[PDB]
Ligand binder design. Structure first.
Ligand SMILES: O=C(O)Cc1ccc(O)c(O)c1
Ligand SMILES: O=C(O)Cc1ccc(O)c(O)c1
Ligand SMILES: [Ca+2]
Ligand SMILES: [Cl-]
Ligand SMILES: [Cl-]
Ligand SMILES: [Fe+2]
Ligand SMILES: [Fe+2]
Ligand SMILES: [Fe+2]
Ligand SMILES: [Fe+2]
Lengths: 358, 357, 359, 360
């Protein structure tokens, strides 16, 4: 288990931005700007800094050209400059590698701490950021698929309980999770800002980044992204969805960028900010837990995820999950899922729902 | 080939209602009234008469208790009372069995003709119907999933060109179809009322009724139906969707009633009323023709459909399709589909899209 | 009274396009293309030809540069080439001035007949038109405010029953109307294509063109047009709405182009194609008849409308309405409206709803 | 000026519920339940306890029968039981009257403090509450107009800067405000939970309660409430909207309950939780500030608001505003409003936008 430091945890406000390494900056720009409509805060020949429609901080997404596509940092904003000091002391006590730069790692961010966290992920903590024009009423720019906020990250890690304890000590509260009747945890979601999540853990080989999620205002905005991708004849880059989530209750869609980084589009989860917010636990065999409508979860969603980098820019070695696999127990050859607990009708043995096999 | 009568075709306005035989009336009522929110026009111990939010004719759906679930009649409204006489002469010349009831077959319909049509389907033609309160501004009754109009039927039949020519003679205009390069037709959509379809032909063993479709105002109304079915823990009765259609461009969902009758929910297709409305042909291997987003079509959509009855209420014998199977050529072991024509990236060989066999 | 000809009426399919004269073509282009997102079929220094997202005929709107902003033609497509000949005979029997051009008045239209109709309006009838790429699945182009179809026209004319009868003889069927208890008709809506209207008559001094209406898919598309106009700091060009209509049950908005031509954005009216479609008559004092939510009807809606041209391009003289004014009887100083018939609560006397009088 | 106490402010989570006094409990139930679709947690002959679709605390609204319709309490939930003690000490240092009930003022709330705050408003602070079934995935119950959360309160008070400083010391952050070029503040919005507001101050005679706001998921849910009010032939109870706000950028509607308590329906404001969230100041003469589309603000919006009670249940005396009136300076006789700053075209002199004047 990861011990709880004597040192006070930093006060984390929210997920704020991700830095993604991409291999072809122009192809990535085309996806994130021309297809998805994100707004350019700054760009040059090496990097593109993008923000959502309602953001005032410098960016939500940095695309950095590099040789290997990977997550380089997932950044959380802290409440005060002094919280960056707290973050540094906290991670030093945990025995984690840290690097602090008073003028930031990327443009538009000031004093920042990056760490290789106990699960192998590159976390950044910062307060100082360059404010930009908040585009929230720029309806002259508004896309029919407009991405309005950064919502969350989702991480793949082999041991969910181990990770969950560490994030709870850091101040995240678990909102929903997935378990079985045999003591296995498959996933958990946890928050600071009072939505279902700021980061989440998905059981699997890791460290890998499962996805970065952006919000829309309404469900039709998500539909429009799918319609546009059909019109562009890139529907093969729609991985899963659209649907209603069980966990989170949000309307959702998963798409893949040119380097196969998975982006979720997400809307209309619920308020979690009360400290006794009731925690919802689903059974892993409940076929409405991921897609509420019982639509099958494609195996690539379980198996594929992005590499992550260490502070030297090198790919982190992947550690294999030894706990049961959600894929195997639900849609594999010996898998099972149900629609109604205890009802054989609407249950699936050794295959996925709605008529499909792997 | 089905010859064109010399008798003038009835002037058909639109699809108007279906009569479905159901085995358990209370269970069926629960689905159509309590789940789907259709409005009761009349009921007793034997039948439930239901209508959509914007309808003024007596009903769009009649549920009739019987021993074997099946389509008993698919009904079209005609322009004038004299068009029922035309329909009778027309089908008599075709050599079809007909039955005329001057006082109707079901409540709220007057003078009506039922026929066993040349494709084996029980069609009704009528003009006279009891007007009821049009609920189109009754927002005090409006459901988050409200079904606002009856939109179309879809029929499974073995020989699509044969059926298409028969429907064209009857005045239906083809709007869209699916074909391959060898010249096989897999499906056609055709209309009277100036939408993408009033009835449609799906290639397969028939006569069987593929579905009845109702429209909503907006796409979120369809999402709500899915969400409601999840809450009621009957998500297993969501067969396919929700999705954007390629053919028709409509947003869609397919669900199954307690007797496995398939209901489509549908919104936002386009205007087809001009006589030179451009006809759209899709290639059968195009993975965006059915679901525009490339989601796979579940095999049950191609294989399962409702029995239909003859005028004595016995189940109509089925004729097997001998033309190529859309299932087999797209998602079966020797099938294939593409995202971009001529591109192996985003193509699927011997399985369906998105990772599924 | 306008007589019914012996000659058969042409079979009219639908409203198809309007030709509007505009005074500054670049300013008008900015409005219809950059603000509203209509699609250009053809343009030059003299004209801009525009279509909606789902259209396959050549255009829904022609902007023609000229000295005096006005309606030059409201055009209906007919079912067959021969229906143009029927239109010509029909209007010649009515004693109307007609002009026939075998190769069209505007680009992308073939054989066409323009008439100065018995109410002074320039109608066009045509069958032949150049087909274009139907953009209905071009979601790479789709705007958050996308205009998907042309829906209808609305005409201001002093004597509504006189015009209604003439349109009925032409095959248009009345769907809804607005009357009072003492027999005055204020407005009527009438269709060919199976929606609430293809053209409509608003009582007032005329001939003038009240508006041209385009459809969206959903209500939020209309909300976006408002939002965008706020962002562009042209909210003063939002005239009325958005709202829910009583008559038609459609969600709506009225906006003004650079020459004050009024454009309606409209969605989700109901099917009227059955021949016994039930007609709906509203009382003029029913404050839910126009805006169903009871929001006040802005006075310019009742007073302002576009000039129309005759076949020489000169403005048609205006004839004054002598029947009662809807403005006056509902929101003027002697006006009244109700929420519930017979209830003083929720009634308005000498002013509009929601606490406003006329400015 | 209201001094900053030495005692630490309670840690406030969010607005949580209001208790409104109503004169006819059945008529009020018809409005909030049958019209608006709120969910009944408990009721009897004297009270109705209601909650929104996504709520897990016992209620968001208590309707209490009494002789005079009024706000009885606006309630904020605090982070810990100990914050109720902090609240008591804080308000005692402010010199305010307070009342502490270990088992609650209303059913489903435990240990609770009510205070007559420095602006004369009855605030409640509590932590303990009975959890109920959270209905957030009960789509079998979901209405076409479903109210999904309680969002905020809005208070009418004569001196906005005085109130603003007090609420800032209590830890609310101002997100937007309306001012003019001559030093007057007409309104301010302020939050704890990371939306545009939890409570707000509107300049006017007070203390009075301007509104309680509930949110929906989507704009069409707000359209449906209007549509249903039309079908029920109660469109006279739609006061203002629907619209897009300038302040907050939310889609909105204002409606009136049977006692004229004003309810806002609200959706799709933006995230404010960062501590340096940019404060937006609108000029009072900007005609897109309140309705972004420039629709005129109905005069009753500026003049009418609910009475509020003291801790004895008596109506609080009203103190008149002496600062300039937003109504007067925008749509009154000497009013002015603009569409584009510095452009005469689209400006309005001595009347409202869109062709309207103030009714007599
Ligand atoms: O299978 C598909 O998705 C094509 C399709 C289009 C329109 C319809 O009404 C329908 O039932 C089926
Ligand atoms: O004024 C109103 O609100 C009534 C009305 C209904 C339908 C329309 O198309 C229209 O232009 C006007
Ligand atoms: Ca001043
Ligand atoms: Cl999921
Ligand atoms: Cl406001
Ligand atoms: Fe996610
Ligand atoms: Fe269909
Ligand atoms: Fe109109
Ligand atoms: Fe408010």
């Amino acid at each position: 288990e990861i011990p709880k430091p004597v040192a006070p945890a930093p006060d984390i406000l929210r997920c704020a931005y991700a830095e993604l390494v991409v291999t072809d900056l122009a192809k990535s720009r085309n996806f994130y700007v021309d297809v998805l409509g994100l707004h350019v805060s700054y760009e040059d020949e090496n990097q593109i800094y993008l923000r959502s429609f309602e953001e005032f901080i410098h960016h939500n997404l940095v695309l950095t050209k590099g040789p290997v596509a990977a997550l380089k940092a997932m950044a959380f904003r802290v409440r005060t400059p002094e919280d960056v000091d707290k973050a540094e002391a906290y991670y030093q006590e945990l025995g984690c590698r840290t690097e602090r730069r008073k003028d930031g790692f990327v443009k538009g961010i000031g004093d920042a701490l990056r760490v290789e966290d106990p699960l192998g992920f590159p976390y950044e903590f910062f307060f100082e950021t360059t404010h930009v024009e908040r585009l929230h009423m720029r309806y002259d720019l508004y896309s029919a698929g407009e991405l309005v906020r950064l919502d969350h990250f989702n991480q793949v890690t082999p041991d969910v309980p181990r990770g969950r304890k560490y994030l709870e000590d850091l101040g995240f509260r678990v909102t929903e999770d997935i378990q079985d009747d045999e003591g296995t945890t498959y996933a958990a979601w946890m928050h600071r800002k009072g939505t279902v999540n700021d980061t989440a853990l998905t059981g699997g080989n890791g460290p890998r980044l499962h996805h970065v999620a952006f919000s829309t205002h309404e469900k039709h905005n998500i539909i429009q992204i799918c319609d546009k991708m059909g019109a562009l004849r890139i529907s093969d880059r729609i991985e899963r969805g659209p649907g209603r989530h069980g966990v989170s209750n949000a309307f959702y869609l998963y798409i893949l960028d040119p380097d196969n980084h998975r982006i979720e589009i997400y809307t209309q989860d619920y308020y979690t900010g009360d400290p006794d917010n009731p925690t919802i636990t689903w059974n892993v065999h409940d076929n409405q837990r991921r897609d509420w409508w019982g639509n099958p979860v494609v195996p690539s969603w379980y198996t594929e995820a992005s590499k992550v980098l260490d502070l030297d820019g090198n790919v982190q070695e992947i550690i294999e999950r030894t706990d049961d696999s959600e894929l195997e127990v639900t849609i594999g050859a010996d898998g099972f899922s149900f629609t109604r607990a205890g009802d054989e009708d609407g249950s699936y043995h050794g295959q996925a729902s709605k008529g499909f096999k792997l």
